[PDB]
Amino acid sequence: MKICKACSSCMVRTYVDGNIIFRCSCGESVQGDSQNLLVSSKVYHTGEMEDKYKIFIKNAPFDPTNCQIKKDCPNCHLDYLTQICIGSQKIIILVCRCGYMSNRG
């Protein structure tokens, strides 16, 4: 959205002769240059995106209720890892408290 400089209100976007013009309730009118060429957007599979589980994946090595697995961590050589299974495709991620995380992330 575009915020009015004068009154900091949400300006109304209309389209005139091949240009996006924002007009406010206080009469201030501005035209967006490049960053306002986004009428609408949607994101699918929001329930299994990587940005969904960033906090959870970060906290997984410290949560005591997560399933562990007997595998060596290649960074700290700890002999156990934390195994999580996220998404409808059952993506398996192995995480450790040292910062190691399978899938290279």
């Binding site: 490049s34 986004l38 009428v39």
Partner: protein, 193 residues
């Protein structure tokens, strides 16, 4: 009990006794017999035909879509969204790879940017070329550009659909729809193809 196969406590008897229409059926099914008796003997032939008849709408192949107020000219540098300004690199390749698919002269100020779900394209076995033909055969009032079909992870496949001016000339006498309204109506038609 799951959606589409709900045969839990009384539902199907209620669908029969109440004469509920087909739109209200939670467990509708159908049995199809192959035309050739020789084909029905072989399981693989019946297996590929079964996967042939399965509604894969264009929406479910999309991870995210963006509606942009942009027009495309091959020579003139029109304004482009800054987060998607890198798309021009594969636009030049498309123009030199299709000497017959040149941009029209009546492209409107409306762009739909599509980022295909490459995982769904693999599991459902749907090629990029098949999607392009299906959309161009159903929507003659649009101009469609696409990136290269890549086999390397990390680089997505981008579908770009440009609305022509005739998309609004369909019915603009009904002035109770701004050009933003028709464009939103068009993208709903594209996704449900």
């Amino acid at each position: 009990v799951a959606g589409g196969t709900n045969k839990s406590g009384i539902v199907r008897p209620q669908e029969i006794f109440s004469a509920k229409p087909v739109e209200a059926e939670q467990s509708s099914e159908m049995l199809l017999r192959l035309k050739n008796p020789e084909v029905e003997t072989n399981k693989t032939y019946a297996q590929e035909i079964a996967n042939s008849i399965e509604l894969i709408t264009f929406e479910r192949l999309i991870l995210q879509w963006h509606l942009l107020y942009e027009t495309y000219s091959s020579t003139k540098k029109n304004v482009m969204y800054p987060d998607f300004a890198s798309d021009v690199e594969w636009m030049t390749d498309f123009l030199e790879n299709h000497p017959l698919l040149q941009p029209p002269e009546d492209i409107a100020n409306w762009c739909i940017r599509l980022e295909l779900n490459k995982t769904t394209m693999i599991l459902k076995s749907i090629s990029l070329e098949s999607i392009i033909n299906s959309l161009r055969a159903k929507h003659p009032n649009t101009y469609i550009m696409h990136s290269v079909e890549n086999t390397a992870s990390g680089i997505p496949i981008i579908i770009r659909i440009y609305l022509r001016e005739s998309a609004f000339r369909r019915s603009t006498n009904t002035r109770m729809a701004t050009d933003e309204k028709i464009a939103v109506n068009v993208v709903d038609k594209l996704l449900n193809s």
